[PDB]
Design a binder for this molecule. Structure first.
Ligand SMILES: Nc1ncnc2c1ncn2[C@@H]1O[C@H](COP(=O)(O)OP(=O)(O)NP(=O)(O)O)[C@@H](O)[C@H]1O
Length: 280
């Protein structure tokens, strides 16, 4: 699929840099015709088929195709797409309140209610995605951005669809590996992947939200991955002594090696606690 090939600078002015990633940079921008603000994600194209630099057109088109499908309060939407010889430029909904990662770093200690308030929104966004058979495959605090960080209960949106896939045959078998700290055992073991992998990542996020500590993190990537595959985590009393047993139950039912035995997104919403890159 081709995209708009007019110069994006004819239509937008850019400002502050918002973040960067695998061959991408994201800049705050303003559309000239409306004064409305967006996040422009400049993704570097591959210069040759066999190149390892830049993102393949197949991978760019998948991200764009998935983004075009989604409209939900807890996910980022796509406004427009431009391209030129070197970049595909995705004009995305702006999320101005920073990463959940940075929010957690600055505050250092959430209550169960604060954690649940974030987690419920994450679960709602993932419920929408999974209802559409979209696996995100890179859920982590860096990929959950706050609308406004200066309210008591910040609203969030899931970002970064660079690894997301449609799962129309229950599982996908590639070619898919997220951040070691957050990937499921099936990712570590290069097994077929489905929506269940996101549920594992939600378990890891929940553990971090409640404790400020990462359940599987070793001193090297290989150690983290070995820990993940072995389900080598525990609830440290120093961090969890005043955390409810129900919260621990929720995490325990997500951090399960066999993807078939793991809670689904629907299970997670009915759970009594809730119900009202890989190489060194
Ligand atoms: N819609 C948005 N609003 C505000 N900031 C954003 C938005 N999208 C991305 N960012 C920031 O830009 C960073 C990189 O964007 P992302 O979409 O994760 O690119 P990426 O190349 O897939 N990263 P990686 O997963 O490391 O390869 C994010 O971590 C955010 O800090």
């Amino acid at each position: 699929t081709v995209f708009r090939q007019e110069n994006v600078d004819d239509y937008y002015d850019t400002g502050e840099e918002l973040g960067s990633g695998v061959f991408a940079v994201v800049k705050k921008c303003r559309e000239k015709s409306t004064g409305l603000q967006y996040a422009a994600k400049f993704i570097k194209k591959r210069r040759t088929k066999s190149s390892r630099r830049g993102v393949s057109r197949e991978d760019i088109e998948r991200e764009v195709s998935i983004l075009k499908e989604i409209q939900h309060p807890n996910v980022i939407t796509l406004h427009e797409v431009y391209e030129n010889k070197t970049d595909v430029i995705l004009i995305l909904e702006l999320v101005a309140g920073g990463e959940l990662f940075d929010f957690l770093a600055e505050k250092e200690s959430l209550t169960e209610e604060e954690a649940t308030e974030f987690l419920k929104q994450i679960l709602n966004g993932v419920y929408y995605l999974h209802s559409l058979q979209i696996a995100h495959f890179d859920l982590k605090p860096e990929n959950i951005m706050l609308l406004d960080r200066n309210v008591p209960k910040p609203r969030i949106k899931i970002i970064d669809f660079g690894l997301a896939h449609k799962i129309d045959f229950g599982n996908e078998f590639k070619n898919i590996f997220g951040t070691p700290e957050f990937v499921a055992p099936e990712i570590v073991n290069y097994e077929p992947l489905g929506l269940e992998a996101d549920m594992w990542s939600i378990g890891v996020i929940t553990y971090i939200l409640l404790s400020g500590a990462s359940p599987f993190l070793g001193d090297t990537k290989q150690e983290t991955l070995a820990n993940v595959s072995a389900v080598n985590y525990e609830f440290e009393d120093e961090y969890f002594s005043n955390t409810s047993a129900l919260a621990k139950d929720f995490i325990r039912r997500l951090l399960v090696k066999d993807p078939k035995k793991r809670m689904t997104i629907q299970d997670s919403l009915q759970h009594p606690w809730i119900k009202p890159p890989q190489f060194e």
